[model samples]
Target: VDMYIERAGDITWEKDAEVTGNSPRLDVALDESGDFSLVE
Candidate 1:
């Protein structure tokens, strides 16, 4: 599956990596507006 993220301004970003699993392998922290940053 693919991983994705969204920022506060409604701006969204995504990661190109894909993994075979039933769920996310990592944890994500978001602000009150539900936003986060992505890493290269």
Candidate 2:
């Protein structure tokens, strides 16, 4: 599932919006190599 956010920047999605049988999340951070990592 995907959503279009009105703002342009870093975004975070936690467990608040979980559905009946699905949950989505995005965990972003600067990784070991100093590059951003987006994990779902």
Candidate 3:
């Protein structure tokens, strides 16, 4: 699973609008990096 850890410059999703499923979150910020790391 992927997580869009909001960038300091993000303004769209920050408003918590029509987004859903927690799948669109896969489109993470370009300037940022993500890891496949998992948690317990």
Candidate 4:
């Protein structure tokens, strides 16, 4: 449910981030407000 992905600028996860249920989808996500938005 959480991962250490490549950081982009000042945007960063506040402790954790929810990811896709589908395996091998580490980068796929919907970072609305940068938290709890659900992955794409």
Best by the lDDT measure = 2
- In the range 1-40, model 4's lDDT, one tens digit per residue, is 6977885688666666676576553544556566644444
TM-score of each: 0.23, 0.25, 0.16, 0.17
- What do the candidate models score in CA lDDT, each in turn? 0.65, 0.77, 0.51, 0.59
Residue 16 in model 2: shift from native, Å?
Answer: 38
Best of the two (3, 4) by lDDT = 4
The parts of candidate 3 lying over 4 Å away from their true place are 1-32
The clash count of every prediction, one per candidate, is 0, 0, 0, 0
Between candidates 2 and 3, the lDDT winner? 2
lDDT string for model 1 (1-40, tens) is: 9999866584456587575768656556667888875433
Would you list the rank order by lDDT, best first? Answer: 2, 1, 4, 3
Question: Which ten contiguous residues of candidate 2 have the minimum total lDDT?
Answer: 17-26
Report per-prediction Cα RMSD to one decimal: 15.2, 11.7, 13.7, 14.9
Ranking by TM-score: 2, 1, 4, 3
- For model 2, residues 1-40, the per-residue Cα lDDT tens digits are 8977686865778678866775767698987899998866
Better of 1 and 3 by TM-score: 1
